[PDB]
């Protein structure tokens, strides 16, 4: 029974942590994607302002 416990832990644990630690990547993607679009859109808008 504590065997089947360890397989269940490993399976659900592995799947969930894979999803969350990938969401870490989409998160840092959001971080520096916001940072880049900040100045990018900034220069389009300040070029269309004049």
């Amino acid at each position: 029974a504590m065997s089947m416990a360890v397989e269940s832990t490993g399976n659900a644990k592995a799947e969930a942590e894979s999803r969350a630690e990938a969401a870490r990547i989409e998160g840092e993607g959001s971080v520096l994607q916001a940072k880049l679009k900040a100045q990018a859109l900034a220069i389009e808008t300040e070029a269309e302002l004049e």
């Binding site: 504590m2 065997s3 360890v6 397989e7 490993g10």
Partner: protein, 51 residues
């Protein structure tokens, strides 16, 4: 006929002894089966946690 009936009695006793030995050896063999399965799945632990 009364000699043959006691031949039947002694062979019936022998069959009873044979089935007794069969069942006791069989029960001890399920005993060692349970021990072997429990031990194999004791190491199936480490196998499956690190799997």
């Amino acid at each position: 006929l009364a000699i043959e009936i006691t031949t039947n009695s002694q062979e019936a006793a022998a069959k009873h002894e044979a089935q007794r030995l069969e069942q006791e050896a069989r029960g001890r063999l399920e005993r060692q089966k349970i021990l072997d399965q429990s031990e194999a799945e004791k190491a199936r632990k480490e196998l499956l946690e690190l799997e």
